[PDB]
Amino acid sequence: AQHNMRLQLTSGTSLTWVDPNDFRSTFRINLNVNQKVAGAVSVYNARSEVITNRAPLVVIEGCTDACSVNRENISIRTTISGSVENKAAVLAALLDHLHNLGLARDDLVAGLLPTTIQPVVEYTG
Amino acid sequence: AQHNMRLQLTSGTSLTWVDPNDFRSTFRINLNVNQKVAGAVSVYNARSEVITNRAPLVVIEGCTDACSVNRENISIRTTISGSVENKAAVLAALLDHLHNLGLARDDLVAGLLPTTIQPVVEYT
Amino acid sequence: AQHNMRLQLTSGTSLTWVDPNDFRSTFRINLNVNQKVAGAVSVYNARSEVITNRAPLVVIEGCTDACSVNRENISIRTTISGSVENKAAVLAALLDHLHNLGLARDDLVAGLLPTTIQPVVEYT
Amino acid sequence: AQHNMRLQLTSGTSLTWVDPNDFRSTFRINLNVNQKVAGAVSVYNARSEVITNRAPLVVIEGCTDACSVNRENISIRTTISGSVENKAAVLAALLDHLHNLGLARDDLVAGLLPTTIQPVVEYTG
Amino acid sequence: AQHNMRLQLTSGTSLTWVDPNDFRSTFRINLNVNQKVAGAVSVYNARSEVITNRAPLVVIEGCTDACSVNRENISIRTTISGSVENKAAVLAALLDHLHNLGLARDDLVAGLLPTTIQPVVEYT
Amino acid sequence: AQHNMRLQLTSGTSLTWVDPNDFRSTFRINLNVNQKVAGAVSVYNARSEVITNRAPLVVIEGCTDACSVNRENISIRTTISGSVENKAAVLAALLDHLHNLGLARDDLVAGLLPTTIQPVVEYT
Show the 3-state SS of chain C. CCCECEEEEEEECEEEEECCCCCCCEEEEEEEEEEEEECCEEEEEEEEEEEEEECCECCCCCCCCCCCCCECCEEEEEEEEEECCCHHHHHHHHHHHHHHHHHHHHHHCCCCCCCCCCCECCCC
CA distance C86 to E22: 15
Residue E122: count of CB within 10 angstroms of its CB: 13
Instruction: Provide CB contacts within 8 A for C31, sequence distance 6+.
Output: C13, C46, C47, C48, D108, D111, D112, D113, D114
- B–D contact: 3+ Cβ pairs < 8 A: no
How far, rounded to the nearest angstrom, does the alpha carbon of residue B8 sit from its chain's CA centroid? Answer: 19
Q: At what angle do helices D87-109 and C87-108 cross, to 10 degrees?
A: 180
Count chain A–chain C contacts defined by CB atoms under 8 A: 19
Experimental method: X-ray
Tell me the residue ranges of DSSP E strands in chain A.
6-10, 14-18, 26-38, 41-54, 74-83
**Smallest Cβ distance to E10: which of C12, C44, C84?**
C12
Chain E residues in contact with C33 (beta carbon < 8 A): 8, 23
Q: What 3-state DSSP class applies to E65?
A: coil
C-beta separation of A90 from B73 below 8 A = no
Q: Cβ F31–E2 below 8 Å, yes or no?
A: no
B45 in Cβ contact with B36 (< 8 Å): yes
Is C23 in Cβ contact with B111 (below 8 Å)? yes
Q: Do chains F and E touch (3 or more CB pairs under 8 A)?
A: yes
Q: Chain B: residue nearest C18 by CA?
A: B112
Q: Which residues contact C4 (CB under 8 A, 6 or more apart)?
A: D118, D119, D120, D121
Report the alpha-carbon distance of residue C60 to residue C63 in Å, rounded.
5
Taking Cα atoms as reference points, which of D27, D22, D21 lies closest to residue D8? Answer: D27
CA C22 vs CA C56, C124, D94: distances in Å = 10, 39, 18
Instruction: Give the relative orientation of helices A87-109 and B87-108 as an angle to the nearest 10 degrees.
Output: 180
- The shortest C-alpha distance from E67 to chain C (Å) reads 8
Amino acid in position D110: A
Segment (H or E) for D106: helix D87-109
CA-nearest of A98, A18, A87 to A51 is A18
Q: Which residues of D touch E4 (CB under 8 A)?
A: none
Q: Which residue of C has its CA nearest to B59?
A: C67
- For residue A12, what are the CA distances in angstroms to B31, B61, C28, E34? 34, 27, 12, 24
Q: Which residues of A touch F (CB under 8 A)?
A: 6-8, 20, 23, 66-67, 69
Q: Resolution of this entry in Å?
A: 3.5
Sign of CA dihedral A66, A67, A68, A74: positive
A vs E: CB pairs below 8 A: 12
Alpha-carbon dihedral angle through residues E20, D76, C98, D91, given to the nearest 10 degrees? -110
Please give, rounded to a whole number of angstroms, the shortest distance from the CA of B112 to a CA of chain A.
8
Residue A77 Cα, gap to closest chain F Cα (Å): 25
Interface of C with B (CB under 8 A): 6-9, 18, 20, 22-23, 66-67, 69
Residue E23: its chain C contacts at CB < 8 A? Answer: 33, 44, 84
User: How far is Cα E56 from Cα D30, in angstroms, rounded to an integer?
Assistant: 47
Chain D CB contacts of A42 below 8 Å: 39
